[PDB]
Amino acid sequence: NNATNVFIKVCEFQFCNDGVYSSANNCTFE
């Protein structure tokens, strides 16, 4: 989430270990 709204997605989401995600495959349900 962030200050004004929420962010829900269904993607590959490789890794952050900390622009959190760095991959996008079969990105559905934004």
Add this chain to the structure above:
Amino acid sequence: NFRVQPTESIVRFPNVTNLCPFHEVFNATRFASVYAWNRTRISNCVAD
């Protein structure tokens, strides 16, 4: 036993406001070639 038969049958469903961009893919001018075709994700839409 006695019953009152229903006067009429009413079907009610929630109002739909998904409004999938079917019109957006039906008025485009800059269509690309045949071998390079999208796979448009029709998700949480309404099949209108």
